[PDB]
Amino acid sequence: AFDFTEGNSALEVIYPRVGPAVRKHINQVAMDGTLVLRVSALMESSWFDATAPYHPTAVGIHSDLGRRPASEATQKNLNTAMLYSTYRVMQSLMPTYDAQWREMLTSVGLDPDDDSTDRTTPVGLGNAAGNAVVEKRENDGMNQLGNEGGQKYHQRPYSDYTGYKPVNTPYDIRNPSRWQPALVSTGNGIFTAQSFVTAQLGRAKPYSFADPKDLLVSKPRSSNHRNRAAYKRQAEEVLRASANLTDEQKLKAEFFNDKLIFASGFMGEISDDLMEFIHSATASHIAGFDVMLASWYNKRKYDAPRPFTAIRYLYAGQKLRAWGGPGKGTVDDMPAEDWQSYLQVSDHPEYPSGSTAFCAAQAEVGKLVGGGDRTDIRYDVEKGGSYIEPGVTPAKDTSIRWTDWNEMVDDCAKSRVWGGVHFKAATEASKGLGAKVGESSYRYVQSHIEGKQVGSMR
Template identity: 55%
Template sequence: MALCSAVLIGATVAVAPMTAHLNRPAAAAAAFDFDKGNAVTGLLWVRVGNVIKTIVSPRGNDATLVFRIAALSATAQFDAIAPYHPTAVGIYSDLGRRPASEAATNRNKNIAILYASYRVYSSLVPQASAEWRALLTDVGLDPDDDQENTDTPIGIGNRAGKAVIAARAHDGMNQLGDEGGRKYNRQPYSDYVGYRPVNTAYRLEHPSRWQPATVTKGNGIFTVQQFVTPQMGVTKPFSYADVKDFPVPPPHNSDARNQKGYKQQVDEILATSAGLTDKQKMIAEFFDDKFRGIGFSSGNIAVNKGVSLDRFIEHTAAADIAGFDALIAAWAAKVKYDAVRPWSAVRHVYGGKRVTAWGGPGKGTVRDLPADQWQNYLDVPDHSEYPSGSTSVCAAVAQSGRRTFGTDEITLSFRFAKGASFVEPGITPAADTTLSWTTWSDWMRDCGLSRLYGGVHFKSAIAASSELGPKIGDRAYELVRRHVEGRTGPES
């Protein structure tokens, strides 16, 4: 994913708290090697993630917007280098074929990638226009060069980026805030499908259904959650035609009439909460940050395989499209089933009775916690519980990665320094902790379990998403593969 912002250190990444500094020193950026480097890992990884976190998603956990930005930018990057490939054709543009001599080094491809990315980021996050311009000026490129001459990498990059923007501006996500015919005072990404919760934040009338929580930043101001981008479920996918091709079975245990199943999954959440280890907490935090937990993981796996720039871009395009398209299917089911979160279900089952669970930051496991004061380890998500969006994405990304590299084997390792937790800063983990994976399957499994550890999903949601994601990962891989091979006609 071109949105990653952690720092690459060999095969291991030292994960530190994000800072508010958006700009990398210009001198460091100017040292980028256009002929041998990779503009995504060498430039965009360092800077883009911090910008998106500052403006869009401070903790990187707003999956729908994060993965839309990732999918559109990765597609633009793929389309920008397609003219330098022997057979490839862009997903949203066909910009011809450049001579093989122009692809002898990475220079032209990197320039095209940067201009395509600049156009997409400027469209999706215009608030950061100064930073996007600096992405180019810091390496000696002119952001005002808007030529569309396909004999030049600048023109190719501009056209590739603009084509993706045009194709996705009205894809259903309401990027421009004009869906439903709204002309004035537009609100980008606002709901136009008319979702309304059946429960209020103050009363759980329907214990099977999602309840918006009341949240605060600790400043005395409390707000009621709104279901984030419910229109995601009707957004146009990249890799398939109809979300109905990927049905998700109903969450029977979240039906309050199924008292045994309902209580059983609540008790499982409480038992997990009570038994949290430092490693489980770090797994929960790692995957909750979609930049480093999913995007950077996927990209770092490719880096560790030593792939070429072309191969890297093919992988990230397939992976990011897979993640975005998996979220579309997951969100359609989320709106359809509108299932209760553990946060509400624990209160419904136990009310004010004392339970044993994690007692909050720095409290460890306590045995006298009133159930109506129980909290997830992670923040309460602002959408319904079933299925798990994060697990759907991980499962889709893992499958696309298996297909791209022809193996389940990976090399991936991340290190958390002592006390690096954002939930329990200075306390957790008690010692430096390394998370490592050697297969996509293990990485995907921990991604799913991270939602259980975080207290935000029941196991049934994780299981359903683990079944859903790979099917879409296959579709995304096959879409990108067709375009790599130039098989883009109706017969393909």
């Protein structure tokens, strides 16, 4: 029931199956940007590579698959290349979802046992393109296969092979100027301590630049607790934002915090030309992948503490005015040792903000695609639809709209402070960081579009 000649296989066949799998596999809140954006970058650049011969000049990022006559550039042909290259990438990234990927193909009539690599057919181009992405990314340094350092047994995808250790335990703040893992429980009586997710990411191969070394942000000096005044001030800002939350801040925090929810507000930016959609989506999420890698390089270098670690340190034995938790509204007697961010604070150091650097990179790419600051980004949440306070937030039906790329970025920054997971400085540093990677990935893909292979993916 999909129209190869007129539909968009991404929006109608691929996304409806890959989004849910990602939530089922990784996290119900699509919160783990280095995992979801690896899927996102790898899948969609495989679209770019699988359909490059149907463009007048484009060459692929991971493969050089030649040229086809412009008359073969049918909607059906692009769609078919897309579905097969997705198939190979997802079979590499999420093998335990083998059945789901086969069904992705068979539900639209294609055969998942067709492993042809004929560069004259859209199935061969899809297969060749997806296999090339998989061959170039399985051992890119992120440890997708848990084999780095010659590990033959008990392989765990994306395990850290680089020996990162935190200097605080989840139970003792030994160093308030350094990251501390949070103790977390889903509510079933099991408790676990966070572990720096994809701590090795900083060593993985980027797309649009050679080394994250050259995207170093400045030291987060307000997070040096010996700078007593600036350290206490940013913590006071996080407590005020917590104490003063509005429904709209809560939701804007929830929006920018879930990458799938975030992308779902973009259906007003989508071109009607399939090739255009592919080229924009490739630059967008190559920017996302690369900015996450730059963010994680920075995050590991500075190893900065999340707000709760500062609030616990500064306000020990005290009771704070803050958000009281689901359905409690603001309270005056939050014990500092129980205080939580509104959002669940993620499993990595605080500085800078990965979500914000992805917002900024995406807006940089957005501007370069549409020529100006104009956009149309939308989020609609029914009464009680919040995923932090279901049944309480928002109190009434809510529509949030952005029409300027910059104001959206600014809100995304603000929202991590409202969310409780970042100090102001992290979000500010991520604006310039995202801007740079978003332009560099735009120029990287645009070069390839224009027939110029650049970089070292091949």
